[PDB]
Amino acid sequence: RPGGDTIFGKIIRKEIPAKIIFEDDRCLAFHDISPQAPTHFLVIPKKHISQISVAEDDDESLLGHLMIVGKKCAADLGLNKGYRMVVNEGSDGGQSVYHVHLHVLGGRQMHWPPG
Amino acid sequence: GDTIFGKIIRKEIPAKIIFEDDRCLAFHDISPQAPTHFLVIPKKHISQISVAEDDDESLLGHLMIVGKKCAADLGLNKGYRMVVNEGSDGGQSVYHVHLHVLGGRQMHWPPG
Ligand SMILES: O=c1ccn([C@@H]2O[C@H](COP(=O)(O)O)[C@@H](O)[C@H]2O)c(=O)[nH]1
Numbered sequence: 001r002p003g004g005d006t007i008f009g010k011i012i013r014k015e016i017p018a019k020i021i022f023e024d025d026r027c028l029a030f031h032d033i034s035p036q037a038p039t040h041f042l043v044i045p046k047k048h049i050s051q052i053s054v055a056e057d058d059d060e061s062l063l064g065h066l067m068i069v070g071k072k073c074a075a076d077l078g079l080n081k082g083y084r085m086v087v088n089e090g091s092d093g094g095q096s097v098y099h100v101h102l103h104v105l106g107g108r109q110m111h112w113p114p115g
Numbered sequence: 116g117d118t119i120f121g122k123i124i125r126k127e128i129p130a131k132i133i134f135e136d137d138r139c140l141a142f143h144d145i146s147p148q149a150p151t152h153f154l155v156i157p158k159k160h161i162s163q164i165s166v167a168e169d170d171d172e173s174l175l176g177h178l179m180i181v182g183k184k185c186a187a188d189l190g191l192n193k194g195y196r197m198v199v200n201e202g203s204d205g206g207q208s209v210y211h212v213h214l215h216v217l218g219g220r221q222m223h224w225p226p227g
Contacts, residue, residue, distance in 0.1 A: 036225035052183050052197065064176030067199065071164050074201070082202020085164070086226045087179075089186075090194020092218050105226070110206050113148035114198045114215070115223040 004048040008099040012046050021073050026065055029073045038107030039077055043070045049100040052089050066102045079106040084114065120156055120211040133185050139178055141185050150219030151189050155182045162210045164201050178214045191218040196226065 003009040010016045011030065018030040021041055032040040043066045049055055055063060067085065074083045083106030088095045094115075123130045124140055131143040133153055144152040155178045161167050167175060179197065186195050195218030200207040206227065 052179060053187065053194075055180060055183065057180060060176030060180050061173040062176065063179045064172035064174065067164060067175045068167060068169060068172050071167060071201070075165065079204070082165075082200070082205035082207065084201070084205045084227065085199040087197040088194075088222070088226075089183075089196065089218075092191070092194035092220065093196045093222055094224055095194065103226070106204055109204055110200070111227040112206050113227065114206075114217070115196065115226040 003046060004099065006048075006097055006099040008044050008097055008101065009048060012044070021077070022069060024069070026062055027069055029069055032103070037105035037110070039074075039079060039083075040103065040105045041073065041077075042101045042103060043067075043073070044099060044101040050098040051095060052087055052100060055100065063100075066100075070102050070104045074104055074106060077106075082106060084110045086114065116210070118160075118209050118211045120154075120209050120213065121160065124156070124158055133189070134181060136181070138174060139181055141181055144215070149217040149222070151186075151191060151195070152215065152217045153185065153189070155179075155185070155214040155216065156211060161212045163207060164199050164212050167212065175212075182214050182216045186216055186218060189218075191216075194218060194222075196222040198226065 021029040086103040134141040198215040
């Protein structure tokens with residue numbers, strides 16, 4: 001089972017259902033099960049990386065691709081007033097799934113500080 | 116149009132610089148929202164993430180790798196939050212794309 005057995009690894013392999021927005025060879029975008037904004041989705045690599053603090057230098061293009069796919073999906077979902085992208089790292093970040101992912105939140109005014 | 120982050124990149128006004136290379140700059144946020152709060156910005160003037168090009172992919176990823184290395188160097192061993200704001204709903208404050216890195220306290224949910 002390539003990609004590991006976190007819930008996101010299993011979503012990648014279609015073993016657990018998700019509401020998928022976009023998929024390519026490098027990543028997957030799907031709606032968050034506990035949305036914190038009217039639109040709230042995740043962009044995740046298909047390659048398993050546990051957290052950003054252990055990403056390798058050669059992962060740069062992949063991490064950037066998450067953001068490019070994030071902004072394209074946001075446009076496709078009509079978030080024309082904007083949105084916020086978030087990565088939660090470790091305990092102080094509140095990370096709860098150790099498979100790297102980018103949150104994209106919009107459809108309402110986001111506030112400052114960002115948590 | 117130029118921004119205050121352009122002035123910072125050009126060293127025209129001061130900032131507490133953490134790291135620099137040929138394509139990005141990391142510096143402490145002047146209005147910190149956590150005990151550690153810094154920015155990583157590209158030297159290329161991309162005004163907002165919504166207009167970033169496909170060719171910008173590795174540059175954007177570079178901001179994140181530089182961010183995580185700076186976070187480690189600044190002792191954020193318990194973790195942190197990375198943020199990119201887009202547009203008015205995103206609360207984007209400067210139209211030069213920038214990665215926020217916040218830590219040194221528990222970050223909360225929702226993220227604004
Ligand atoms: O089956 C799952 C499990 C988690 N999540 C979402 O993944 C995120 C995990 O938390 P964090 O690691 O991003 O803090 C949360 O927003 C949570 O709702 C899902 O969408 N589906």
